Amino acid sequence: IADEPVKASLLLHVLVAHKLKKSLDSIPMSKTIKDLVGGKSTVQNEILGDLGKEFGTTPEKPEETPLEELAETFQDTFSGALGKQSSSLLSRLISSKMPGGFTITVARKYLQTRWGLPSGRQDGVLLVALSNEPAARLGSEADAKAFLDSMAQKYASIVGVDL
Amino acid sequence: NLKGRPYTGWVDSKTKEPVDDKDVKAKYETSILEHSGIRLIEPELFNG
Numbered sequence: 178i179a180d181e182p183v184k185a186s187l188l189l190h191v192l193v194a195h196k197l198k199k200s201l202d203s204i205p206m207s208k209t210i211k212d213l214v215g216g217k218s219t220v221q222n223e224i225l226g227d228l229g230k231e232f233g234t235t236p237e238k239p240e241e242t243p244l245e246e247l248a249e250t251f252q253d254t255f256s257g258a259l260g261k262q263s264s265s266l267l268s269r270l271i272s273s274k275m276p277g278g279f280t281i282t283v284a285r286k287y288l289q290t291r292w293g294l295p296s297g298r299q300d301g302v303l304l305v306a307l308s309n310e311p312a313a314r315l316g317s318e319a320d321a322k323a324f325l326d327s328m329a330q331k332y333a334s335i336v337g338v339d340l
Numbered sequence: 341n342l343k344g345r346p347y348t349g350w351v352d353s354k355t356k357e358p359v360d361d362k363d364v365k366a367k368y369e370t371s372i373l374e375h376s377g378i379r380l381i382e383p384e385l386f387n388g
């Protein structure tokens with residue numbers, strides 16, 4: 178289908194949600210990183226370190242800027258690329274929670290064949306998969322395919338795509 | 341901000357592309373002289 182590059186507002190919202198260990202819905206974009214974190218500066222400074230490694234250059238004081246103004250300031254320079262911090266997050270999601278033999282490229286082939294989603298959508302489906310990483314490894318291949326299918330519909334809901 | 345970098349100055353009003361004052365004359369003077377002064381009536385300016 179249509180290949181639109183992944184939005185920075187979704188990427189940023191996933192990285193914060195993954196770090197705070199909360200569901201993507203539990204973090205409102207209106208709240209600031211300093212408000213969200215609840216006084217735990219070490220968590221807040223690890224978030225600012227993840228954002229600095231992901232995008233590169235960051236605004237003056239990103240902990241007091243709400244996640245909207247921070248998302249659009251990143252988007253002005255954001256080339257659309259996966260990132261380095263997201264490379265490691267997705268590498269360790271696939272290595273630690275997917276069945277033995279089921280690598281990242283086999284999931285990239287499956288979602289392409291099943292949904293007709295290009296590499297720009299498949300990035301987004303893998304990012305929304307990261308924000309709600311399952312506690313235990315999915316032993317069966319069909320449970321990993323049912324998770325990836327459920328994540329596609331959740332990504333499709335968030336963006337507004339009809340399959 | 342304009343294409344990432346911080347810019348201060350004139351830009352083309354259509355394309356938002358930066359325009360240096362030196363370049364304004366080579367880039368626009370022909371269009372300025374064409375659409376100024378005594379000239380054929382332009383329907384867009386007089387309600388078609």
Ligand SMILES: *OP(=O)(O)OCC(C)(C)[C@@H](O)C(=O)NCCC(=O)NCCSC(=O)/C=C/C
Pocket residue numbers: 216217218219220
């Ligand atoms: O948000 P937090 O992780 O709670 O940040 C810790 C905080 C700096 C607020 C403070 O409570 C703390 O850690 N106090 C213990 C003493 C300490 O770490 N002192 C050195 C801090 S850096 C400094 O002095 C720099 C000056 C330019």
